[PDB]
Amino acid sequence: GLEKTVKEKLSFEGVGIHTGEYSKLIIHPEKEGTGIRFFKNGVYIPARHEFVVHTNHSTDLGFKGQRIKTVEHILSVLHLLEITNVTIEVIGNEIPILDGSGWEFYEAIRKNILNQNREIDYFVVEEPIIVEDEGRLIKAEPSDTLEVTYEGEFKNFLGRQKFTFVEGNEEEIVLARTFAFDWEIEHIKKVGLGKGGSLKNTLVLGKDKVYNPEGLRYENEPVRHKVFDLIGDLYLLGSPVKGKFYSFRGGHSLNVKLVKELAKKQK
Ligand SMILES: O=C(NO)C1(COc2ccc(C#Cc3ccc(CN4CCOCC4)cc3)cc2)CCOCC1
Ligand SMILES: [Cl-]
Numbered sequence: 001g002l003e004k005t006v007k008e009k010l011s012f013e014g015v016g017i018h019t020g021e022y023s024k025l026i027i028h029p030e031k032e033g034t035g036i037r038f039f040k041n042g043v044y045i046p047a048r049h050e051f052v053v054h055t056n057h058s059t060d061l062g063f064k065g066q067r068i069k070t071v072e073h074i075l076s077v078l079h080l081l082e083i084t085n086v087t088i089e090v091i092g093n094e095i096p097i098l099d100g101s102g103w104e105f106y107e108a109i110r111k112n113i114l115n116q117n118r119e120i121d122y123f124v125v126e127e128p129i130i131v132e133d134e135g136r137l138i139k140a141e142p143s144d145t146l147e148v149t150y151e152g153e154f155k156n157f158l159g160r161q162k163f164t165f166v167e168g169n170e171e172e173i174v175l176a177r178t179f180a181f182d183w184e185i186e187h188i189k190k191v192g193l194g195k196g197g198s199l200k201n202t203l204v205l206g207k208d209k210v211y212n213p214e215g216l217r218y219e220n221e222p223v224r225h226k227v228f229d230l231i232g233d234l235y236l237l238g239s240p241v242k243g244k245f246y247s248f249r250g251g252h253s254l255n256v257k258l259v260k261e262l263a264k265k266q267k
């Protein structure tokens, strides 16, 4: 496909899930070859794995003393739409969580795409690889299309569930919301996270209960969301990705470990 930017500046705002602070984004058009980067307080932070500073409960980037939490949702949307050149100006410390999904970003960006004059140079997975950490595993292998499967093994009523994204099915994962288990909320608060989490932006589940009165958007909403997160973390390779991925219980730490191993192997 062609490299793409946005036709005009696009703004989003609201509370961040971890900081609980209100922040604002401005997405700016950029020329061919710029890449995806964030901008905060005069500093450009490329959306690349070298700038990862934290991976527990979100993927966060930093450079030169400026940090931005929770980049994975906006990056997943840009990856799915194949937007390749843009500056995400952040006024605040975190990307707004909005409803917990990528929907509002997706709908707004998709209607504002500007095709550019060069083709995309994809990051093409060249050979099979497996990364592992304490029972969690991710496998990547060659594919002409981006294909991503996540399999979860939940310790509640959901049990085992799997979901596969393929190209053309972006609408199947951009509405799946971030989620949390009630027995884990004390830990996330104790480590200074989840300050913006509420039933308005998170699907909260108990051992047997669904807290949200509106219920699940899909019976497998959590694994759809985990696929969505992994697609965002894969964009830290610095180019849209062609490969087939399978994650068993992966999280941001393992997603970034895979990205760094793929990047080292091919560059
Ligand atoms: O989406 C992701 N990363 O991209 C992941 C974000 O982690 C998180 C996402 C959300 C949270 C949270 C929260 C939270 C939500 C609601 C209340 C309010 N209470 C609910 C119980 O009743 C009383 C009122 C209180 C707290 C915590 C962590 C990390 C990877 O796993 C998927 C989720
Ligand atoms: Cl932690």
Ligand SMILES: [Zn+2]
Pocket: 056, 057, 187, 188, 191
């Ligand atoms: Zn933790």
Ligand SMILES: [Zn+2]
Pocket: 072, 073, 178, 225, 229
């Ligand atoms: Zn997420």
